[PDB]
Amino acid sequence: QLTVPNIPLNNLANSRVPAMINKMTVSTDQNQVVQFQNGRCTLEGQLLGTTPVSASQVARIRGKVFSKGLNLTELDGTPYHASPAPLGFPDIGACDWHVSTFKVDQNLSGDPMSRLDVKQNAPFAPHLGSIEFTSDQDPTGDQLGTLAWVSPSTSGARVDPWKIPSYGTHLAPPIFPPGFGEAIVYFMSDFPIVSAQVPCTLPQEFVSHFVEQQAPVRGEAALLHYVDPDTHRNLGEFKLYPDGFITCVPNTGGGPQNLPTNGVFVFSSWVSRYYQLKPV
Amino acid sequence: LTVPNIPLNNLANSRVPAMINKMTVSTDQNQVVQFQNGRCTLEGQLLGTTPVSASQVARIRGKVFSTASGKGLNLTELDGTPYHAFESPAPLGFPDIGACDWHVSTFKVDQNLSGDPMSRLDVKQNAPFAPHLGSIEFTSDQDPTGDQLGTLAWVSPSTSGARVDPWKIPSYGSTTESTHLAPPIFPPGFGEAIVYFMSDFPIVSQVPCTLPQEFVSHFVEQQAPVRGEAALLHYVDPDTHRNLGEFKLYPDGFITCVPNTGGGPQNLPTNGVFVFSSWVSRYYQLKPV
Numbered sequence A: 001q002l003t004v005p006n007i008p009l010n011n012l013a014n015s016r017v018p019a020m021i022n023k024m025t026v027s028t029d030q031n032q033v034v035q036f037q038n039g040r041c042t043l044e045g046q047l048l049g050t051t052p053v054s055a056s057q058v059a060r061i062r063g064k065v066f067s068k069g070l071n072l073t074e075l076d077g078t079p080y081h082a083s084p085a086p087l088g089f090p091d092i093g094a095c096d097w098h099v100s101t102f103k104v105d106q107n108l109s110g111d112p113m114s115r116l117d118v119k120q121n122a123p124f125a126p127h128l129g130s131i132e133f134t135s136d137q138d139p140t141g142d143q144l145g146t147l148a149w150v151s152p153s154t155s156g157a158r159v160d161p162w163k164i165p166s167y168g169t170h171l172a173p174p175i176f177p178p179g180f181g182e183a184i185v186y187f188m189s190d191f192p193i194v195s196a197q198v199p200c201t202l203p204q205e206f207v208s209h210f211v212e213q214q215a216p217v218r219g220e221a222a223l224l225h226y227v228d229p230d231t232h233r234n235l236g237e238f239k240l241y242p243d244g245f246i247t248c249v250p251n252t253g254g255g256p257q258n259l260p261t262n263g264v265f266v267f268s269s270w271v272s273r274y275y276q277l278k279p280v
Numbered sequence B: 001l002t003v004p005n006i007p008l009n010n011l012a013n014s015r016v017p018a019m020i021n022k023m024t025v026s027t028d029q030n031q032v033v034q035f036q037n038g039r040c041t042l043e044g045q046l047l048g049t050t051p052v053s054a055s056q057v058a059r060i061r062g063k064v065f066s067t068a069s070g071k072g073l074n075l076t077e078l079d080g081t082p083y084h085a086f087e088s089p090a091p092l093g094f095p096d097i098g099a100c101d102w103h104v105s106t107f108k109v110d111q112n113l114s115g116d117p118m119s120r121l122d123v124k125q126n127a128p129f130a131p132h133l134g135s136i137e138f139t140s141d142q143d144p145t146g147d148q149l150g151t152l153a154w155v156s157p158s159t160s161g162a163r164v165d166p167w168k169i170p171s172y173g174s175t176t177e178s179t180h181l182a183p184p185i186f187p188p189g190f191g192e193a194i195v196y197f198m199s200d201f202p203i204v205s206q207v208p209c210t211l212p213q214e215f216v217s218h219f220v221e222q223q224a225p226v227r228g229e230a231a232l233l234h235y236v237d238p239d240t241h242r243n244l245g246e247f248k249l250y251p252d253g254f255i256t257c258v259p260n261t262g263g264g265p266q267n268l269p270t271n272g273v274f275v276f277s278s279w280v281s282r283y284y285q286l287k288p289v
C-alpha cells in the first residue's frame, strides 16, 4: 500500500532550496499555475524535471571553469548531456544567483570559496550545458557549490521565487489547481532573497520515498491525514495526486498556514478524483 | 527491516552537507571514532547531535550577542526553538568536525535583506567554545545581528601549521561538564572494520561518516523492531543485480565489512545499493570484500 514518510513537517527539507520546511501555505491567487522543475516526482516514483533524489543535491551546481563561465557537469562530475539542466540545478527563476563553490580536486589554501554571480540573461543556457558568471574571486577547474542567495535581475525588480528559469528543454509540466475549491499546498522555507519564502510542491524526503517505494497508483487521489504525533488527532485532510502534488480546501480566511508544523502526513485511503475535503 | 533502496552515490553525508562519493576502511582498522552526527540506532533512536534531514547536517542557528571582547551566538535549535542542553551535546545538526576553525555562512532570518545578505562567522575551537553551555564566539568581516541561520562552509587549521583532522570531534563543554555524547564506535573484532562513507569538502590544510544521512531518517521513520544481533546486508550493483559484497549493520547503528588484504570497500563501485538479507548472529562470519 502507498505510504508517505513518517516524519514531521519540521523535519522535512525543501526540494527547491537547501533549507527545512517551516510552514505550509496556499497561493494568494488560488488559481495560480506553477511549473517548478525541482521537487517533481510522480507517486509511482518517476522523477521529473531536474529533480534529484537527495536533499543535499537540491540547488547545487558543478562544472569546469572556462575563462568566464562553467561548462556544466552532473553533481558527481560525470558528463551532462544536453532534461532541462543537470540534476539538482537550481530552478529559482528570473533573478541573479550567487553560488558558493570550491575547487574539488585541489589542495586548498587561503580562502577556498568562490562566489559565482550568475545572471539569467542571454548566455544563461544551462540546457545547452553552459552558464556565465562574474566573480570577485578567481575560480579555476572543477567547481562544486550551492546556491547561497538570490537578488533582482535589474535594479528595482523584485525576486519572485514562484517563477522558473528559461533553460534554453523537456520541462516537467505545469501544475494546475485540480477539481473544485481545492488549493495546492506549498511547503515554504526561509532563504536569503534580496528584494518572502521559497515554495515547493513536495518535501524532498517525499520525493526520495516515492523513488524508493515505486508504489502502484490504485485510485485517482490519495486522501492523507495530517496527524499530531502525540495526541494522534487528525488535524486536517489533504489530497495527494498521482502527478505528485498535494491539495487542501482552505477554510475561508485561513488554511494550512494555521496548522502546527510538527504534524505527520499519513496515508488514509484512495479516493475519487472529486472527493470533497473537510476545510482546514 | 529494510535499508534505503537508493544507490550509494545518491546518499548524503551525515557530517557535512555533501554527497557520498566512496566507502573506505580506516588505515588503522583498530581506530575508534566518536562522531556525534550520523548516529542513530537501528530501532530509530537518534544519538548525539544527529538530526533527521540531510538539510539539517552541520548547520548552526542562534541570536547574536556582543560583549567588550567580541561577538557570539546564543544557540538555538535550527527551527529557532530552545536548545536541549539537558540531553544533547549541542543543538541538533550542530557541526561535529573537531579541532579546527569553522567558517559558517549565515543570513538574518526574518530580515528584509539588502546588499550582500551573507555573513561568514569564523569560529575557533578554543576556550569560549562551549556549545554545550549554549554559546559560541566568532569573528566576522561582516556585521551579523539578530537571528542568524547558516551552514558550515569550510574548515581550516586552529593554528598556523596545524592540520585539520576531520575524524576528530569537538570538546563541547567548558570544563568535568556532562555533555551527553553518543558513545564511541568500536571495531567489533574478528577482522571486521568499520565502513566509513566519505565526501569531498573544502578543508584547508575527505570527511568520513558512519551512516549515510538517509539511513538515519529511514531508521527514524520505520521504528523497526530489532529482531537479531546484526543485520546482514548485500551491496548490490543496480544495473547487473550482482552481489558485490556482504556487510553487517549493527543495532547501535554502524556498518562493518571484512576488507580484503590490501583492499576493502574503497575498491567497490560507488553506485551500489545496500539490501537487507537477514537477521544474523553478532558473530556471523563475513566474506572479505
Ligand SMILES: CC(=O)N[C@@H]1[C@@H](O)[C@H](O[C@@H]2O[C@H](CO)[C@H](O)[C@H](O)[C@H]2O[C@@H]2O[C@@H](C)[C@@H](O)[C@@H](O)[C@@H]2O)[C@@H](CO)O[C@H]1O
Pocket (backbone or CB within 6 Å): A096, A098, A117, A151, A152, A153, A154, A155, A156, B115, B116
Ligand atoms: C543602493 C544601490 O545602488 N545598490 C546597488 C546594489 O543593488 C547592487 O547589487 C546588484 O544589484 C543588481 C540588481 O540591479 C543585481 O542583483 C546584482 O546581482 C547585485 O550585485 C550583487 O550584490 C552586490 C551588493 C554585490 O555583492 C555583488 O557582488 C553581487 O553580485 C550593487 C552591485 O552592482 O551596487 C549597489 O550600489
Ligand SMILES: CC(=O)N[C@@H]1[C@@H](O)[C@H](O[C@@H]2O[C@H](CO)[C@H](O)[C@H](O)[C@H]2O[C@@H]2O[C@@H](C)[C@@H](O)[C@@H](O)[C@@H]2O)[C@@H](CO)O[C@H]1O
Pocket (backbone or CB within 6 Å): A110, A111, B101, B103, B122, B156, B157, B158, B159, B160, B161
Ligand atoms: C600562512 C598562510 O600561508 N596563509 C595564512 C592563512 O592560513 C591565514 O588564515 C587563517 O589561518 C588560521 C590558522 O592559523 C586559521 O585557520 C584562520 O581561521 C584562517 O583565517 C581564515 O582564512 C584566512 C586566509 C582569511 O580568509 C580569514 O578571513 C579566514 O577566517 C591568514 C589569516 O589572515 O593568513 C595567511 O597568511
